[PDB]
């Protein structure tokens, strides 16, 4: 039979034979293994209702991130410092800069990851414990990691639709590229997951459009949230049906699209939704890695974008992380540490490979 | 399913005439290279199959060996690692008294007095029937791994056919295990900090099976992990079970099922080991896998062997083994092990992943 809900509409992460059983047990304990509940909003809801719902969901998701990320620390010591820069429009952008203890401007320079966190570009913050933990685990492998606190479409850092968060990520990356000696860095890659995978991809396309593409040496985009088509459910993206309500329901995502682009006038704009890029948007981009999760409704738009990058002549590696729901290898360090650290090491090795 | 559409099953499940050259999933750089080499179209049906006599399967395998070795030389001999590597040869004694040659690759200047490096004991592919550790693609692979800061031991094990034949199961398995035991007994002399098994296809089979044999023989503690690429582990290529759709979906993507069905026979001429997990790890029970050290299973997307590798990844997890499972997209069988000049980013992504895993076990 067909996998997931294509073969059995009642299947869930908890009953799907593909799920890593350690992850399935943890999700079951968290109440996240069954099919996700139908949300009170959807893509036909009022923008104000979608914003209010997203703002309500933010604290719940932040608590989950705190549970998953705060129970440990890297085995190598890491320093974190805060910096504030000014965006193109004059707003202040907070940066969290993670580095191995004892790394200075006088050390041998290290590769740099500018990290753009997930949350559908709508909610969550760089200060959340799971994202702080991720940036410190990356730094502990021998990296300088810059976590961007960009504006969100909703929630505590809201309410700023496209392209506010994108401009903040671009301005932060430009600042990093202009401060390589001070930070002690040798190369710069963009990396992030889900909405952060969107923002890392779009920041790089924007750098091409703004003429500073040479500053970015590569992109490592995890489970990218890049089609915006969760209301439509297109034929080209079977995972949207196959893994629907695996952690995220399609109605929830259809509602969360609206705060990012309330008029829908950027639905086909690749800077908002990279899946819609033309080959011309992608020509000349630096090497990319696209890493998708097997049991993720977003899997197939990530793989489609992997293929489009290749068709545009970009050097691209494509990976599926098996047994995982959406973004599980970014968070569940206490449950599937071998998977989590396999991804940490893969990102670090890629960053070093660009130096 | 993955990378497909709701109106069309992937590969030959949706279009029986599809090939690596026309499949929308193929990395276009790889598709272009295969087209230029004449290997993008569906592979030709072989002159032997699962109904042929064993002697005929051996003779065909011996003939095909030279062709595959020449392809490996075309792909592997055009360059060298960007970090300098030393290669030395050592000969050891197998349990039955045969000599086993080892090719030992290490960074130049690494000695018994250096800080110790992780070690990869590498078991090459060829269906356990053909190809040798001295082939240019395998030598290149071991040196590229060594260049990342590893000691890499290439095992020249006995084959079921070809130049190193004709030795059915369990000859090659015993050679790999004895090589691993020797490495584990010479850590100081080699200057190594940990030992992992790694290999692709028939070599993925042998790395998996060597580790299960180590469990059965009581020296499992010597092996810190296994990185098995596109493993050739079911032996079911004649049957085409419905549990393994990739066998139909990607049939004749480089390898046709009849060729693989024929290659089973030299490994196990009597068929009496068809369900023996040491010969065909896919048939392991949960108790065969309990207690194994951490595994990485890495499969290729457009590979007829993909689904038996993924099935084994899931069984390892059922048995409580810490296991990471990866699909390398856009690639035919073992392409990330060989096509360094065509898809170098994919090739070196796998090289870096194996090296990082080896370091993670030290």
XYZ file of C-alpha atoms in Angstrom:
717
model
C 0.000 0.000 0.000
C 0.961 3.657 -0.381
C 2.911 5.219 2.522
C 1.365 7.224 5.339
C -2.128 8.622 4.912
C -2.056 7.932 1.165
C -2.515 4.250 2.056
C -4.305 4.574 5.414
C -6.164 7.854 6.113
C -6.221 7.111 9.862
C -2.434 6.792 10.128
C -0.526 9.115 12.452
C 3.086 9.607 13.487
C 2.344 7.265 16.380
C 1.091 4.457 14.143
C 3.192 5.004 10.992
C 5.729 2.145 10.626
C 8.343 4.598 9.265
C 8.682 6.639 12.466
C 11.834 6.196 14.499
C 10.390 4.320 17.513
C 12.336 6.490 19.971
C 10.774 9.577 18.421
C 7.343 7.914 18.269
C 7.499 7.161 22.001
C 8.552 10.727 22.847
C 5.809 12.230 20.673
C 3.297 9.902 22.324
C 4.342 11.146 25.757
C 4.103 14.755 24.596
C 0.614 14.247 23.173
C 2.014 14.950 19.689
C 1.881 11.444 18.145
C -1.806 11.436 17.162
C -3.095 13.404 14.189
C -2.887 17.141 14.819
C -6.218 18.730 15.704
C -8.128 20.853 13.210
C -7.332 24.473 14.155
C -9.964 27.167 14.770
C -8.622 29.170 11.790
C -7.782 28.289 8.190
C -6.864 29.972 4.902
C -10.340 31.548 4.636
C -10.043 33.178 8.024
C -9.679 36.902 8.570
C -6.031 38.118 8.764
C -6.656 39.413 12.297
C -7.855 35.961 13.392
C -4.787 34.274 11.878
C -2.489 36.736 13.664
C -4.317 36.251 16.971
C -4.172 32.466 16.638
C -0.462 32.533 15.775
C 0.259 34.813 18.735
C -1.581 32.361 20.996
C 0.250 29.308 19.598
C 3.673 30.939 20.021
C 3.924 30.459 23.807
C 2.915 26.787 23.568
C 5.534 26.110 20.923
C 8.162 28.032 22.908
C 7.453 25.842 25.941
C 7.909 22.727 23.816
C 11.208 24.116 22.520
C 12.312 24.832 26.086
C 11.588 21.256 27.159
C 13.501 19.815 24.221
C 16.504 22.150 24.299
C 17.279 23.199 27.857
C 18.143 19.825 29.429
C 21.833 19.834 28.452
C 24.782 21.748 27.043
C 27.494 21.040 24.438
C 30.390 18.926 25.720
C 32.683 21.693 24.462
C 32.409 25.093 26.134
C 30.750 27.931 24.227
C 30.589 31.703 24.765
C 27.464 33.680 23.816
C 27.512 37.449 23.370
C 24.783 39.848 22.265
C 25.145 42.564 19.638
C 22.602 45.023 18.248
C 22.812 46.395 14.704
C 20.657 48.755 12.662
C 18.593 47.496 9.753
C 18.182 49.287 6.439
C 15.052 50.978 7.810
C 16.654 51.946 11.105
C 15.171 49.231 13.293
C 17.395 47.468 15.801
C 18.295 43.841 15.112
C 19.571 41.760 18.012
C 22.245 39.153 17.250
C 23.250 36.219 19.461
C 26.867 35.318 18.655
C 28.027 31.842 19.748
C 31.657 30.783 19.585
C 34.032 28.329 21.255
C 35.365 29.721 24.512
C 38.702 31.413 23.958
C 37.997 32.241 20.317
C 38.978 35.834 19.557
C 39.733 38.142 16.643
C 43.347 36.989 17.157
C 42.612 33.269 16.797
C 42.816 31.363 13.549
C 39.516 32.257 11.838
C 36.576 29.829 12.016
C 33.722 29.218 9.552
C 30.559 31.173 10.293
C 26.905 30.116 10.152
C 24.283 32.867 10.067
C 21.327 30.972 11.525
C 17.718 31.856 10.671
C 15.307 30.102 13.031
C 11.979 28.487 12.159
C 8.418 29.308 13.091
C 6.914 29.858 9.619
C 8.336 33.417 9.561
C 5.407 34.194 11.873
C 6.341 33.104 15.436
C 9.196 31.974 17.756
C 12.424 33.813 18.642
C 16.171 33.318 18.441
C 16.223 33.395 22.247
C 14.078 30.242 22.512
C 15.962 27.469 24.287
C 15.924 25.013 21.363
C 17.474 27.581 19.003
C 20.041 28.737 21.557
C 20.936 25.071 22.123
C 21.267 24.454 18.374
C 23.525 27.457 17.801
C 25.716 26.457 20.768
C 25.985 22.835 19.577
C 27.063 24.134 16.166
C 29.542 26.551 17.755
C 30.988 23.708 19.845
C 32.146 21.944 16.659
C 34.400 24.919 15.905
C 32.118 27.574 14.431
C 31.014 31.144 15.004
C 27.209 31.044 14.862
C 25.178 34.233 14.481
C 21.539 33.908 15.517
C 19.389 36.647 13.949
C 16.468 38.020 15.983
C 14.420 39.110 12.961
C 10.945 40.677 12.945
C 8.017 38.232 12.787
C 4.629 38.454 11.100
C 2.898 37.785 14.445
C 3.560 36.944 18.082
C 5.859 38.775 20.488
C 8.125 40.058 17.689
C 5.183 40.971 15.408
C 3.373 42.120 13.452
C 5.548 42.593 10.365
C 4.621 40.890 7.072
C 6.975 40.061 4.240
C 9.575 41.400 3.603
C 10.430 42.658 7.109
C 12.005 39.492 8.513
C 13.789 38.827 5.215
C 15.319 42.316 5.249
C 16.480 41.772 8.850
C 18.180 38.493 7.889
C 19.817 40.113 4.854
C 21.024 43.109 6.871
C 22.450 40.806 9.559
C 24.276 38.706 6.959
C 25.680 41.876 5.369
C 26.879 43.040 8.791
C 28.587 39.695 9.414
C 30.209 39.874 5.965
C 31.535 43.357 6.840
C 32.927 42.262 10.243
C 34.892 39.116 9.368
C 38.069 40.250 11.072
C 36.300 41.378 14.222
C 34.331 38.130 14.478
C 37.370 36.055 13.472
C 35.608 34.203 10.646
C 36.807 32.655 7.370
C 33.601 32.033 5.390
C 29.860 32.621 5.829
C 26.999 30.209 5.134
C 23.268 30.716 5.699
C 21.408 27.947 7.514
C 18.005 27.416 9.097
C 15.009 25.113 9.296
C 11.374 25.330 8.138
C 10.478 29.049 8.010
C 14.163 29.552 8.715
C 14.990 27.397 5.706
C 12.761 29.707 3.690
C 14.576 32.765 5.070
C 18.056 31.327 4.423
C 17.136 30.497 0.810
C 15.422 33.855 0.258
C 18.246 35.835 1.884
C 20.636 34.297 -0.614
C 18.347 35.041 -3.590
C 18.009 38.613 -2.283
C 21.790 38.948 -2.041
C 21.919 38.120 -5.743
C 19.264 40.768 -6.461
C 21.103 43.362 -4.318
C 24.575 42.620 -5.704
C 26.316 41.193 -2.625
C 25.948 37.475 -3.440
C 29.723 37.011 -3.289
C 29.583 37.369 0.515
C 27.613 34.090 0.931
C 29.641 30.897 0.491
C 26.808 28.382 0.797
C 23.348 27.571 2.115
C 22.240 24.636 4.298
C 18.446 24.665 4.289
C 16.575 22.204 6.519
C 12.941 21.085 5.924
C 12.203 24.339 4.049
C 8.700 25.822 4.313
C 8.655 27.384 0.880
C 5.552 26.691 -1.242
C 2.805 28.569 0.606
C 0.345 26.151 -1.064
C -1.034 24.412 2.038
C -4.595 25.560 1.272
C -4.388 24.361 -2.350
C -2.779 20.950 -1.770
C -1.279 20.687 -5.314
C -0.843 17.389 -7.137
C 2.905 17.975 -7.422
C 3.334 17.738 -3.615
C 2.044 14.341 -2.410
C 3.651 14.655 1.031
C 1.098 17.372 1.872
C -1.522 14.603 1.842
C 0.726 11.704 2.826
C 1.930 13.316 6.080
C -0.948 15.723 6.742
C -1.459 16.275 10.483
C 1.929 14.685 11.187
C 2.761 17.331 13.793
C 1.284 20.064 11.554
C -2.149 20.129 9.925
C -2.569 21.742 6.514
C -5.305 24.069 7.775
C -2.947 25.428 10.428
C -0.271 26.127 7.818
C -2.818 27.627 5.438
C -3.781 30.022 8.214
C -0.167 30.809 9.120
C 0.561 31.844 5.513
C -1.808 34.804 5.852
C 0.075 36.962 8.418
C 3.213 36.686 6.273
C 1.412 37.879 3.125
C -2.075 39.126 4.041
C -3.096 40.224 0.535
C -1.767 37.112 -1.170
C -0.046 39.367 -3.697
C 3.324 37.708 -3.010
C 2.032 34.133 -3.321
C 4.219 33.618 -6.417
C 7.081 35.858 -5.297
C 10.174 33.655 -4.803
C 11.517 35.977 -2.121
C 8.422 35.153 -0.068
C 7.982 31.518 -1.200
C 11.210 30.153 -2.750
C 9.409 27.175 -4.309
C 8.158 29.593 -6.984
C 11.662 30.608 -8.118
C 12.467 30.627 -11.804
C 15.782 29.324 -13.071
C 16.888 32.943 -13.461
C 16.325 33.653 -9.753
C 18.751 30.836 -8.925
C 21.507 31.203 -11.524
C 24.935 31.705 -10.043
C 23.982 30.897 -6.448
C 26.657 29.266 -4.240
C 26.473 25.580 -3.224
C 23.312 24.459 -1.424
C 22.367 21.544 0.798
C 18.662 20.726 1.082
C 17.841 18.381 3.975
C 14.231 17.179 4.309
C 12.446 15.015 6.884
C 10.809 11.806 5.705
C 7.523 12.127 7.642
C 7.054 15.844 6.982
C 4.197 17.265 4.890
C 6.788 19.784 3.585
C 9.114 17.026 2.291
C 8.151 17.187 -1.375
C 8.371 20.967 -1.829
C 11.885 20.769 -0.395
C 12.821 17.999 -2.822
C 11.202 19.890 -5.721
C 13.322 22.933 -4.868
C 16.418 20.726 -4.677
C 15.689 19.616 -8.260
C 15.075 23.196 -9.435
C 18.343 24.407 -7.947
C 20.130 21.666 -9.892
C 18.281 22.608 -13.089
C 19.531 26.193 -12.613
C 23.148 25.008 -12.399
C 23.600 25.381 -8.629
C 25.762 22.748 -6.946
C 23.204 21.040 -4.705
C 23.200 18.049 -2.354
C 19.812 16.613 -1.382
C 19.239 14.474 1.729
C 16.243 12.860 3.397
C 16.590 12.255 7.144
C 14.569 9.120 7.676
C 12.240 8.263 10.533
C 11.710 11.908 11.498
C 8.760 14.266 11.602
C 9.136 17.907 10.597
C 12.328 19.445 12.060
C 12.845 16.571 14.533
C 16.619 16.473 13.992
C 16.789 20.163 15.041
C 15.192 19.624 18.457
C 14.905 16.110 19.915
C 18.472 15.910 21.205
C 17.495 13.856 24.270
C 15.454 11.330 22.246
C 17.346 10.827 18.953
C 20.811 12.289 19.702
C 22.495 10.286 16.945
C 20.177 11.886 14.361
C 20.428 15.367 15.892
C 24.208 15.305 16.003
C 24.444 13.706 12.548
C 22.806 16.869 11.254
C 24.938 19.154 13.469
C 28.104 17.508 12.134
C 26.856 17.634 8.530
C 26.239 21.395 8.745
C 29.604 22.028 10.419
C 31.488 19.916 7.875
C 29.747 21.766 5.024
C 30.687 25.141 6.542
C 34.319 24.011 6.825
C 34.190 22.720 3.237
C 33.414 26.243 2.041
C 36.342 27.878 3.917
C 5.856 8.528 -2.817
C 8.870 10.743 -2.111
C 9.730 13.252 -4.868
C 6.723 11.986 -6.871
C 3.296 13.339 -7.830
C -0.242 12.200 -7.069
C -0.911 11.378 -10.736
C 2.262 9.352 -11.363
C 4.172 6.800 -9.328
C 7.958 7.396 -9.450
C 10.359 5.819 -11.908
C 9.266 2.705 -13.758
C 6.308 2.188 -11.421
C 4.662 5.109 -13.229
C 6.338 4.853 -16.653
C 7.842 1.441 -17.566
C 10.049 3.044 -20.240
C 11.716 5.466 -17.815
C 15.498 5.349 -17.390
C 18.126 7.273 -15.439
C 18.407 9.530 -18.493
C 14.686 10.414 -18.519
C 13.772 10.217 -14.824
C 12.979 13.742 -13.529
C 14.662 12.818 -10.210
C 18.172 12.247 -11.601
C 20.749 14.912 -10.791
C 21.161 16.511 -14.256
C 24.958 16.526 -13.972
C 24.904 12.780 -13.350
C 22.307 12.289 -16.092
C 24.512 14.185 -18.550
C 27.589 12.143 -17.614
C 25.703 8.838 -17.886
C 24.294 9.909 -21.247
C 27.798 10.738 -22.472
C 29.019 7.290 -21.287
C 26.032 5.445 -22.780
C 24.810 4.309 -19.344
C 21.704 6.515 -19.013
C 19.360 4.223 -20.966
C 17.927 1.082 -19.388
C 20.666 -1.468 -18.768
C 20.706 -4.334 -21.248
C 19.271 -7.666 -20.168
C 22.215 -9.952 -19.278
C 22.957 -13.339 -20.892
C 22.517 -15.060 -17.504
C 19.810 -14.831 -14.867
C 18.515 -16.558 -11.745
C 17.734 -19.684 -13.806
C 21.295 -20.046 -15.147
C 23.787 -22.616 -13.933
C 26.180 -21.510 -11.205
C 29.204 -22.091 -13.441
C 27.676 -19.815 -16.080
C 27.019 -17.132 -13.451
C 30.657 -17.352 -12.335
C 31.913 -17.105 -15.924
C 29.709 -14.094 -16.662
C 30.767 -12.389 -13.423
C 34.434 -12.898 -14.320
C 33.809 -11.351 -17.755
C 31.854 -8.376 -16.379
C 34.545 -7.707 -13.760
C 36.971 -6.200 -16.286
C 34.279 -3.888 -17.677
C 33.245 -2.612 -14.257
C 36.877 -2.172 -13.198
C 37.502 -0.089 -16.301
C 34.493 2.097 -15.483
C 35.837 2.524 -11.950
C 39.186 3.577 -13.401
C 37.476 6.099 -15.700
C 35.766 7.582 -12.646
C 38.457 7.387 -9.965
C 41.874 7.769 -11.558
C 41.549 11.357 -12.843
C 42.604 13.071 -9.621
C 44.008 12.853 -6.129
C 43.036 14.162 -2.694
C 43.783 17.771 -2.028
C 45.530 16.642 1.212
C 48.575 14.351 0.843
C 48.118 10.689 1.746
C 50.511 7.765 2.258
C 49.529 4.248 1.204
C 51.249 1.127 2.484
C 50.561 -2.571 2.030
C 50.394 -5.168 4.778
C 49.686 -8.878 4.562
C 47.964 -10.721 7.398
C 46.871 -14.274 8.099
C 43.266 -15.381 7.858
C 41.681 -17.832 10.292
C 41.993 -20.583 7.709
C 45.602 -19.855 6.734
C 45.145 -17.715 3.601
C 46.932 -14.391 3.209
C 44.798 -11.228 3.289
C 46.275 -8.093 1.765
C 45.465 -4.742 3.410
C 45.913 -1.313 1.834
C 46.496 1.215 4.626
C 45.910 4.880 3.756
C 46.795 7.655 6.193
C 47.694 11.352 6.138
C 51.348 11.869 5.289
C 53.385 12.179 8.452
C 50.965 10.188 10.602
C 52.928 7.728 12.742
C 52.553 5.541 15.819
C 53.620 8.603 17.847
C 51.093 11.082 16.418
C 47.831 11.889 18.141
C 45.673 8.858 17.230
C 43.185 9.124 14.372
C 39.851 7.354 13.864
C 40.018 4.272 11.662
C 37.678 3.108 8.898
C 37.935 -0.541 7.907
C 36.611 -0.364 4.348
C 34.853 -3.264 2.599
C 34.403 -2.560 -1.132
C 31.399 -3.402 -3.306
C 30.949 -5.759 -6.212
C 28.169 -7.978 -4.831
C 30.761 -9.976 -2.828
C 31.510 -11.603 -6.206
C 33.743 -9.236 -8.251
C 36.009 -6.133 -8.049
C 39.109 -5.618 -5.868
C 40.425 -3.214 -3.256
C 43.166 -2.176 -5.689
C 40.603 -0.850 -8.196
C 41.164 2.843 -8.869
C 37.763 4.003 -7.572
C 38.203 2.208 -4.256
C 41.791 3.379 -3.827
C 40.623 6.936 -4.543
C 37.788 6.572 -2.030
C 40.047 5.294 0.732
C 42.566 8.089 0.098
C 39.883 10.790 0.068
C 38.654 9.456 3.419
C 42.217 9.326 4.774
C 42.781 12.918 3.639
C 40.127 14.107 6.119
C 42.230 12.828 9.030
C 41.589 9.086 9.095
C 43.471 5.827 8.898
C 41.628 3.761 6.286
C 42.216 0.019 5.932
C 41.083 -1.450 2.615
C 40.499 -5.199 2.884
C 41.446 -7.350 -0.120
C 38.988 -10.140 0.697
C 38.310 -13.289 -1.283
C 35.526 -13.040 -3.881
C 32.964 -15.562 -5.091
C 34.167 -15.108 -8.711
C 36.519 -13.104 -10.917
C 40.233 -12.559 -10.394
C 39.998 -13.134 -6.634
C 37.599 -16.114 -6.927
C 36.115 -18.571 -6.581
C 35.233 -18.542 -2.890
C 31.568 -18.650 -1.838
C 30.191 -17.452 1.463
C 31.613 -17.232 4.121
C 35.148 -16.753 2.748
C 34.998 -13.010 2.106
C 33.117 -12.436 5.364
C 35.810 -14.293 7.305
C 38.522 -12.206 5.619
C 36.768 -8.954 6.542
C 36.262 -10.087 10.120
C 39.888 -11.229 10.452
C 41.089 -7.909 9.034
C 38.940 -6.047 11.574
C 40.297 -8.201 14.401
C 43.857 -7.485 13.261
C 43.215 -3.746 13.150
C 41.648 -3.934 16.616
C 44.771 -5.709 17.899
C 47.139 -3.117 16.403
C 45.614 0.202 17.497
C 48.860 1.480 18.980
C 50.888 0.436 15.993
C 48.408 1.975 13.538
C 47.918 5.044 15.736
C 44.118 4.840 15.793
C 41.527 5.912 18.380
C 38.412 4.000 17.258
C 37.371 1.518 14.549
C 34.269 1.682 12.345
C 33.258 -0.616 9.488
C 32.163 1.029 6.260
C 31.450 -0.005 2.679
C 28.948 0.188 -0.157
C 26.606 -2.314 -1.864
C 28.193 -5.759 -1.480
C 30.596 -3.938 0.813
C 27.683 -2.596 2.830
C 26.533 -6.197 3.203
C 30.027 -7.216 4.342
C 30.356 -4.361 6.852
C 26.931 -5.171 8.340
C 27.661 -8.907 8.404
C 31.167 -8.492 9.839
C 29.627 -6.610 12.746
C 26.941 -9.274 13.315
C 29.656 -11.943 13.168
C 31.649 -9.983 15.752
C 28.590 -10.184 18.002
C 28.337 -13.937 17.433
C 32.064 -14.412 18.148
C 32.221 -12.191 21.250
C 34.510 -9.364 20.078
C 31.751 -6.841 19.259
C 33.333 -4.288 21.618
C 36.123 -3.719 19.077
C 33.724 -2.150 16.542
C 32.506 1.334 17.488
C 30.089 1.864 14.602
C 29.016 0.930 11.083
C 28.414 3.231 8.086
C 26.756 1.058 5.441
C 26.119 2.603 2.012
C 23.450 1.330 -0.474
C 23.577 -2.162 1.091
C 23.055 -5.222 -1.114
C 21.476 -7.424 1.547
C 18.237 -9.129 0.506
C 19.342 -11.598 -2.146
C 15.743 -11.483 -3.449
C 16.399 -10.020 -6.903
C 14.823 -13.016 -8.673
C 11.569 -12.913 -6.657
C 10.808 -9.164 -6.635
C 8.817 -9.157 -3.377
C 6.070 -6.550 -3.138
C 7.702 -5.396 0.128
C 10.591 -3.941 -1.957
C 9.032 -1.660 -4.586
C 12.339 0.003 -5.501
C 13.361 -3.269 -7.211
C 10.725 -2.517 -9.876
C 10.799 1.269 -9.653
C 14.514 1.559 -10.467
C 15.082 -1.731 -12.294
C 17.754 -1.406 -14.995
C 18.925 1.905 -13.510
C 22.503 0.879 -14.001
C 21.792 -2.587 -12.672
C 19.090 -4.922 -13.951
C 17.444 -7.408 -11.617
C 18.457 -10.360 -13.747
C 22.135 -9.512 -13.362
C 21.770 -9.320 -9.592
C 19.770 -12.547 -9.528
C 22.621 -14.243 -11.373
C 25.241 -12.733 -9.056
C 23.537 -14.250 -6.002
C 24.442 -17.741 -7.178
C 28.277 -17.653 -6.981
C 28.009 -16.307 -3.426
C 25.781 -19.179 -2.254
C 25.857 -21.934 -4.890
C 23.627 -24.367 -2.974
C 21.086 -21.736 -1.920
C 21.277 -23.096 1.636
C 22.130 -19.637 3.025
C 19.305 -17.675 1.367
C 17.853 -16.743 4.782
C 21.156 -16.676 6.677
C 21.651 -13.127 8.046
C 25.433 -13.452 7.822
C 25.026 -13.918 4.069
C 21.994 -11.652 3.533
C 21.567 -9.241 6.487
C 18.042 -8.258 5.403
C 16.889 -11.594 6.857
C 18.175 -10.831 10.347
C 15.762 -11.228 13.204
C 15.536 -8.648 15.974
C 17.628 -10.888 18.214
C 20.410 -10.952 15.587
C 20.568 -7.144 15.750
C 20.145 -6.501 19.477
C 23.122 -4.802 21.085
C 24.863 -3.668 17.902
C 26.841 -0.398 18.018
C 25.548 2.751 16.272
C 24.765 2.424 12.563
C 24.329 4.824 9.674
C 22.414 3.473 6.668
C 22.820 5.639 3.553
C 20.802 4.696 0.457
C 20.622 6.171 -3.047
C 17.280 7.500 -4.310
C 17.305 5.974 -7.816
C 18.686 2.607 -6.706
C 16.738 -0.669 -6.994
C 18.358 -1.619 -3.645
C 16.979 1.460 -1.847
C 14.052 -0.205 -0.095
C 15.931 -3.175 1.373
C 18.386 -0.678 2.860
C 15.548 1.354 4.362
C 13.845 -1.803 5.634
C 17.059 -2.788 7.380
C 17.394 0.692 8.886
C 13.894 0.297 10.371
C 14.650 -3.206 11.674
C 17.838 -1.964 13.342
C 15.737 0.667 15.109
C 13.177 -1.997 16.210
C 16.065 -3.932 17.793
C 17.191 -0.948 19.843
C 20.247 -0.042 17.746
C 21.021 3.671 17.468
C 20.567 4.192 13.744
C 20.629 7.181 11.385
C 18.974 6.707 7.979
C 19.763 8.931 4.965
C 18.681 9.052 1.310
C 21.166 10.718 -1.047
C 18.895 12.211 -3.669
C 19.417 12.399 -7.412
C 21.839 9.461 -7.465
C 21.848 5.991 -8.969
C 23.316 3.038 -7.053
C 26.613 3.987 -5.342
C 26.986 7.169 -7.428
C 28.256 9.211 -4.459
C 31.076 6.661 -4.067
C 32.437 7.091 -7.596
C 31.427 10.149 -9.652
C 33.877 12.597 -8.057
C 34.390 14.529 -11.302
C 30.663 14.861 -12.062
C 28.960 15.446 -8.706
C 31.881 16.357 -6.411
C 29.658 18.114 -3.881
C 27.608 14.915 -3.391
C 30.707 12.679 -3.318
C 32.472 14.813 -0.732
C 29.297 15.301 1.307
C 29.345 11.543 1.837
C 33.110 11.489 2.477
C 32.681 14.208 5.120
C 29.673 12.442 6.682
C 31.601 9.176 7.108
C 34.643 10.970 8.541
C 32.543 13.016 10.957
C 30.768 9.829 12.092
C 34.108 8.080 12.671
C 35.332 11.045 14.741
C 32.022 11.020 16.651
C 32.747 7.464 17.804
C 36.261 8.202 19.142
